[PDB]
Amino acid sequence: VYNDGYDDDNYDYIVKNGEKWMDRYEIDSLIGKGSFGQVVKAYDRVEQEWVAIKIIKNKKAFLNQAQIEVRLLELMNKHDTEMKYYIVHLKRHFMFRNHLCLVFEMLSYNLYDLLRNTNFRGVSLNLTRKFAQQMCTALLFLATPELSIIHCDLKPENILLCNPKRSAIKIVDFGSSCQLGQRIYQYIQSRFYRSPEVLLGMPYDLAIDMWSLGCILVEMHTGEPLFSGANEVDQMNKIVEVLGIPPAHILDQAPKARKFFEKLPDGTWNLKKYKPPGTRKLHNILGVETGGPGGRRAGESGHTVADYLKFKDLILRMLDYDPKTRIQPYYALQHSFFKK
Ligand SMILES: CN(c1nccc(-c2cnn3ncccc23)n1)C1CC1
């Protein structure tokens, strides 16, 4: 017996279809799950609308992660009452049968689900552009000084459609997030989307989320992760294949430089004992001059050489090794990849 019969051996609440809570919510069905717990579709009888209830595991580490999340969501939502900046809306929260419960607006499929639905062949450049514009607008809002929030776990699965037939999105899952100058974490970001400064053990700021965004946008159009490392050494080597050896001024100050690199007599750095550095060109991953990914966009509208050159230019600015010169949200939104 766990939690008087209400919980399973994984710390999760055992969902019961049609259960009534608090003279208010009628639980319908499970609609998603993850490390944190479960998400159910429920009818809110007071507000007369469907909601998504995120039921956190009954275990102190998961409870405290979600308490951090609640505080950040309350801060963000207070500064976007019109819901124009692409962050999910937390309506309220409560404790129920020893589980913290977060009540959200209901959302639809995530962007990994969309990739699966393309048979892992990618969405169009036009749809990629729509997702990119909304994500850059969200990053601009997170960078406002009263927020200064670093999401720290951006990936396709954490970006959700509002409605199944439309391109509008919201970002979810602030459990691993932090604020500039209240930064605590040395180990952060899911591996495929992890920035060079984090891999190298260096100081970090909101620019880590822009790195993740550049990786995400390439994957949305090709269908496959850009840098699919199996461990940190493989991750760094995959980044180097595309982007070359990082600048010496960075490696000279990196606590973990020698996990990946060695310094030569002339002061230059090379890899420790892959395609040679910088020879896996993004120009060819995207298929700029050869019909897009797999050549499959040849003959389609919305996929010109000129369009692809603008996309490539913006991505390479998001993937700058130097976090001080990497493109920032304000300037990303002004880039000619985006439309008047
Ligand atoms: C339709 N769904 C949904 N709808 C609204 C809000 C959220 C949500 C809010 N915060 N988080 N955090 C992690 C994972 C999901 C969510 N999920 C997803 C299936 C679960």
Side-chain angles (χ1 to χ4, degrees), residues 2-15 17-19 21-83 85-164 167-181 184-257 259-263 265-271 274-338 340:
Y2 305 100
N3 192 26
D4 293 320
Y6 289 114
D7 291 4
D8 68 18
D9 68 7
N10 199 49
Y11 323 134
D12 278 315
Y13 186 79
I14 300 166
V15 171
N17 306 106
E19 198 175 44
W21 294 4
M22 299 156 55
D23 275 317
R24 180 163 186 169
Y25 304 101
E26 188 178 342
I27 308 307
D28 179 68
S29 55
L30 189 63
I31 62 171
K33 63 196 178 290
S35 296
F36 57 80
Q38 292 172 112
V39 182
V40 294
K41 176 172 168 186
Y43 198 71
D44 180 349
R45 294 173 168 188
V46 167
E47 295 287 341
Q48 293 172 295
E49 65 181 6
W50 294 106
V51 298
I53 309 180
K54 184 181 185 178
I55 310 171
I56 307 296
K57 287 171 180 175
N58 174 16
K59 191 67 175 180
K60 190 172 260 195
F62 296 101
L63 169 64
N64 286 355
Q65 172 179 69
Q67 297 196 81
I68 292 163
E69 185 176 36
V70 168
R71 174 190 170 266
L72 296 174
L73 286 162
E74 289 177 335
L75 177 63
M76 294 182 292
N77 295 171
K78 163 187 166 192
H79 293 281
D80 192 15
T81 64
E82 303 184 295
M83 297 174 215
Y85 295 126
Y86 308 104
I87 309 305
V88 69
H89 183 208
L90 176 69
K91 297 170 174 280
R92 69 198 71 86
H93 69 273
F94 55 83
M95 186 66 32
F96 183 75
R97 296 182 180 153
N98 300 314
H99 296 268
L100 180 56
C101 295
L102 280 59
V103 183
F104 293 95
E105 63 182 327
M106 200 126 95
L107 301 171
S108 181
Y109 312 127
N110 73 52
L111 267 52
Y112 193 81
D113 298 323
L114 294 188
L115 286 183
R116 180 173 284 125
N117 192 64
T118 74
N119 318 113
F120 297 105
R121 296 182 189 278
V123 304
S124 71
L125 192 59
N126 285 343
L127 183 52
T128 301
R129 186 183 297 102
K130 292 176 178 175
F131 294 150
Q133 198 180 42
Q134 296 176 83
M135 290 296 295
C136 288
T137 302
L139 293 187
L140 182 70
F141 175 62
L142 299 183
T144 64
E146 291 220 24
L147 274 58
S148 298
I149 289 167
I150 317 176
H151 181 285
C152 297
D153 205 11
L154 293 177
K155 56 183 165 185
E157 298 156 55
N158 286 335
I159 309 166
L160 279 63
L161 296 182
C162 299
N163 288 113
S167 68
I169 59 170
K170 294 298 195 82
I171 302 174
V172 305
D173 199 343
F174 292 78
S176 188
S177 304
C178 66
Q179 288 171 293
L180 193 65
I184 294 181
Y185 299 143
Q186 177 182 353
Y187 304 102
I188 50 169
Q189 305 191 280
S190 293
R191 191 190 312 114
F192 296 172
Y193 310 96
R194 183 176 304 146
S195 64
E197 50 270 36
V198 173
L199 288 162
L200 289 165
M202 295 181 76
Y204 67 84
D205 65 16
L206 284 65
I208 73 173
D209 283 340
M210 188 65 75
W211 177 277
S212 305
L213 182 58
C215 296
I216 289 163
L217 294 172
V218 174
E219 173 175 2
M220 292 309 300
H221 188 55
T222 68
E224 306 165 349
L226 176 55
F227 304 128
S228 55
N231 54 60
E232 285 205 325
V233 173
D234 189 44
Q235 189 67 31
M236 183 63 80
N237 274 272
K238 284 174 168 36
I239 296 166
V240 167
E241 284 184 313
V242 178
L243 297 175
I245 305 291
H249 73 272
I250 294 175
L251 294 181
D252 283 344
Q253 299 182 340
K256 295 169 60 183
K259 185 170 184 178
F260 318 103
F261 304 102
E262 69 184 33
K263 198 194 281 201
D266 63 2
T268 68
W269 290 85
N270 297 286
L271 283 162
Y274 297 96
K275 297 162 180 281
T279 67
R280 187 186 173 227
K281 300 291 182 189
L282 187 64
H283 193 84
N284 299 313
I285 295 167
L286 294 172
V288 175
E289 295 181 273
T290 55
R296 293 184 300 275
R297 302 296 181 173
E300 292 188 22
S301 56
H303 293 90
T304 69
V305 177
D307 291 325
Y308 272 122
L309 286 170
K310 289 168 188 281
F311 185 52
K312 181 180 83 169
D313 181 274
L314 177 58
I315 297 295
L316 289 170
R317 297 176 194 259
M318 296 184 174
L319 302 180
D320 190 337
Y321 278 123
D322 187 341
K324 292 302 204 265
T325 55
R326 190 177 301 144
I327 192 162
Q328 293 172 1
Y330 181 87
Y331 289 102
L333 286 163
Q334 302 304 309
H335 192 281
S336 72
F337 180 60
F338 296 116
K340 271 187 170 177

